[PDB]
Structure formats: C-alpha cells, structure tokens
Design a protein around this ligand. Structure first.
Ligand code: ZZ7
Ligand code: OH
Ligand code: ZN
Ligand code: ZN
Length: 241
C-alpha cells in the first residue's frame, strides 16, 4: 500500500491499479492519483480527474510522469473503454503537466492556459497543443475551448501560480481547484515559491464564486472536501498580505 508523506492516504473505495489509485466520485467522474517518490522523503500524491461525457473521456491534469500518465490511459481502456477526446491541464508544474508527451503520443488533444504554455519550457514541461484564453471575469473564451462537454474552465487569478486554472463539471457536485485549493484542515498553502501572495486570497474566493453550487471540492493533494476547503484556503491566504 502506498502511504504518502504528502497527500491523502488510501481509504475504502480506492482502487489500486499499477502504481496509481482511482476513486469514483460520481457516476461519470473519477479521481486519478499518482505518486512521486522522493528518496529519503517518501511519496507525494497528486490528484486529477477523469470524466466520461457521453461516449468519450475527458482528462483533467496529467500524472507526475509520462509512464504514470500512460497508466491512466490503460486504466481508462480497461475500466471505461471509450476514446479519450481531450485533456485540460491546470498549470505548468510537474504534478499537473509532467505526462504531456504520453497524451500526445496517444493522439489526445491537449489544452492549457496560454500562460501555462508560455511558461511550460521554462518549467521543464511540454506545452499543450492548444491555448485557452480568458475574459477579464476569469471565464474561458468559448472559441478556445470547443467541444468541452460539461467542463467549465475558470481562471481565478494568480494564486498558487500566475497561470493556475480551475474546472467545474456541469451536472455534478464537483469543482476542481488543482493546487490552488488546500483542504479545510491544512496548515500550509504548500509551495509558495511561484505564488502571488498579494492576490492569492482573492483568487481562492473567485474560484468559490465561479462555482457557487459545487459541494465536492477536489484538489491536487487532499481527498475531496466540502466548501470549507475554499474558505480555509482563502483565510490562510489572507495572512500572506
Ligand atoms: C505538492 C507541492 C508542495 S509540490 C507541487 C509543485 N512542484 C513540483 O511539481 C516539483 N517539480 C517538485 C519537486 C520536488 C518534489 C516534488 C515536486 C509546485 O511547486 O507547485 N505542488 C505543490 C503544491 O501543490 O503545493
Ligand atoms: O503544482
Ligand atoms: Zn504548482
Ligand atoms: Zn501541487
């Protein structure tokens, strides 16, 4: 059993598949979890999403590595057995974009914030194939996100990074904050090295206001939580200013 140093532990309802863990969150939504092993420190878990939208699958975030991301595709083939149409990746860091080459090799169309694509090489990441742009209110420009089905992509402003984006799943209780949101019991906002400490709190609140209905808040390094994760993240961020 994988017991992360950072990230949620395995609980009942989790399925181990190769080096990864999968958890069903709703009839057509699963959380993928992958682990980066740091010698002398242990494993760091990272979470993304898998969405079945009719007859295709949509992915939110890669795993840490190409091989782990290929394992996600293999899990999809074995458990869902539908074509993977596209992926949205939520900023240019390894936990979110480390497996882009695996998606590209499989013929999967990839999308990221234009800024993520611009930062990608500087951050050691392969850029997505397509760039999302955003209105001043944070909502994705519709023509840059064609055929996204239930995915509602929102740029909340600079926080964890300047490029961080978020994704709601229409028809479900779920909104995904990626690395921007930490859980309601976290005492740290994680790595603030690339963070905007002035604007973080407003960005966390903007995420909450963009997806006001969502009751299940999914994030990169904790199990899904209530909206208290948003409130708590914003309150920790208030202390940075
Ligand atoms: C879990 C993290 C503390 S690390 C991760 C990310 N860092 C990486 O992907 C690094 N490439 C990395 C280096 C060494 C060990 C683990 C991750 C970041 O800086 O936002 N997201 C951070 C976060 O979400 O707070
Ligand atoms: O990250
Ligand atoms: Zn990051
Ligand atoms: Zn992270």
């Amino acid at each position: 059993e994988i017991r992360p140093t950072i990230g949620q532990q395995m609980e009942t309802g989790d399925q181990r598949f190769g080096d990864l863990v999968f958890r069903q969150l709703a009839p057509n939504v699963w959380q993928h979890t992958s682990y980066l092993d740091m010698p002398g420190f242990g494993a760091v878990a990272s979470n993304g999403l898998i969405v079945r939208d009719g007859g295709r699958v949509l992915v939110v975030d890669t795993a840490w590595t190409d091989d782990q991301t290929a394992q996600i595709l293999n899990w999809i083939k074995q458990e869902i057995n539908l074509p993977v149409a596209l992926a949205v990746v939520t900023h240019a860091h390894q936990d979110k974009m480390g497996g882009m080459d695996a998606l590209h090799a499989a013929g999967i169309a990839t999308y990221a914030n234009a800024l993520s694509n611009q930062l990608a090489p500087q951050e050691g990441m392969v850029a997505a194939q397509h760039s999302l742009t955003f209105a001043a209110n944070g909502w994705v420009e519709p023509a840059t996100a064609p055929n996204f089905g239930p995915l509602k992509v929102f740029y909340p402003g600079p926080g964890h990074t300047s490029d961080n984006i978020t994704v709601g799943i229409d028809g479900t209780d779920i909104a995904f904050g990626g690395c921007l949101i930490k859980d309601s019991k976290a005492k740290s906002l994680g790595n603030l090295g690339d963070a905007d400490t002035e604007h973080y709190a407003a960005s966390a609140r903007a995420f909450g206001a963009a997806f006001p209905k969502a009751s299940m808040i999914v994030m990169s390094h904790s199990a899904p939580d209530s909206r208290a994760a948003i409130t708590h993240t914003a309150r920790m961020a208030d202390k940075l200013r």
